[PDB]
Amino acid sequence: LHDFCRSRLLDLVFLLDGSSRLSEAEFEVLKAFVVDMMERLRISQKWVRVAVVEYHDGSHAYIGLKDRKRPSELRRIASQVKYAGSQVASTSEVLKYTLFQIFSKIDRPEASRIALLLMASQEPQRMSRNFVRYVQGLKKKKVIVIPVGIGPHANLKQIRLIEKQAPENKAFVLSSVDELEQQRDEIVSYLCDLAPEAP
Amino acid sequence: PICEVSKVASHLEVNCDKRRLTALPPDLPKDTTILHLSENLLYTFSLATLMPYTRLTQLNLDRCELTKLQVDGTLPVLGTLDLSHNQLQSLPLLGQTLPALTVLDVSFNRLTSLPLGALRGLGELQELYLKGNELKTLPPGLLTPTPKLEKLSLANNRLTELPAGLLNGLENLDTLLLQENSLYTIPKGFFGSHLLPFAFLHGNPWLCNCEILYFRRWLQDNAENVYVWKQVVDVKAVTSNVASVQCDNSDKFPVYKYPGKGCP
Helix, strand or coil: CCCCCCCCCCEEEEEEEEEHHHHHHHHHHHHHHHHHHCCCCCCCCCCCEEEEEEECCCEEEECCCCCCCCCHHHHHHHHHHCCEEEECCHHHHHHHHHHHHHHCCHHHHHHHEEEEEHHHHHHHHCCCCCCCHHHHHHHHCEEEEEEEEEECCCHHHHHHHHHHHCCCCCCCEEECCCHHHHHHHHHHHHHCCCCEECE | CEEEEEEEEEEEEEEEECCCCCCCCCCCCEEEEEEEEECCCEEEHHHHHHHHCCCEEEEECCCCCCEEEECCCCCCCCCCECCCCCCCCCCCCCCCCCCCCCCCECCCCCCCCCCCCCCCCCCCCCCCCCCCCCEEEEECCCCCCCCCCCCCEEECCCCCCCCCCCCCCCCCCCCEECCCCCCCCCCCCCCCCCCCEECCCCCEEEEECCCCCCHHHHHHHHHEEEEEEECCCCCCEEEEEEHHHHCCCCCCCCCHHCCCCCCC
């Protein structure tokens, strides 16, 4: 567990891209990134709660924030996320799910709320109608949305939309899934910095 | 000794889950805000025993095989009550006991019917979960005293009919779970002119005649708001699919595509 992120209070949500842009091997690295990401976070009901959601045309919820399982159990489910590899990875559907189904109420006002969006594709414009409204809606609920771009096929437009509305919404643009292993120590330095500490 | 007491932030949370407790343990701290009593041996339970704890705002009595919940006394600041997966054959009135209740979960029980004005007094209520019961009908003006309601779960029941004014007054409704029932039609002017982001209407034997015309009109304008709830193992997925709403007339034909042949 991190030395900086032990006394932190945070509710983290993992949104994994399930498009065909990332191969089944590249998606496995993304999963390995998430698992190693949680190993350095103090996973507990009092401290840091996690949520793993693999999304494509819809959203598959593997782990919920209100789940009462050991951190070892939560790591296996994250490492056993089935590769979808769909034609379309709707980022608007997963955020609409995050705004209404996951962040409907403020259960922990004493803790920060971060939605880690892992994107590597670009949904059709027919689905990007209410994207901005979903982003500003999470801002009103005080939710720091952090876009994580992987590769050249990442939705650069939707990245800029999130970063321009809130000052805390910083984005991560990577060229490959192998850069996740390099930046894993840096993203946590920002994730935990936005979270309050415990007396 | 047996129960765990932790100090997170300002409030105090006590966890007494899976301890073979038959009743409320003695010498509990009065400055408790959250009480966990999940999975125990509670035959009956009275809310009056929780009165000395005036800091309590959240309660969990799920999976305790509760047969009767006696509603004595009052809890001014209680907002969350969980009674899921129990043996409740009747829904107790929480109106005059829980005025600040915002979340109520009575899912996977055995509710055969609901009395008149079962939610009267729950003005601050926002969510109601009645999934996995045996509700066949609904009382008139059920969600009337709850205008701030946002999520309604009536899924996996045995509902055959629906009140036309069930969603009346709801201006904050964003989620509607009505799948896995025995519904055949949708009442005229049921959804109104309110925007409903989520609507689960699949798994129902919709009788596609001339009465379902209004339903099709709503599905064609709100196709982006129709979703499907499918669960494998513990993985729960929600995907938009307007074609899920299918006619009972076995062609596996989507309701929103059914042509109005012979209806004015």
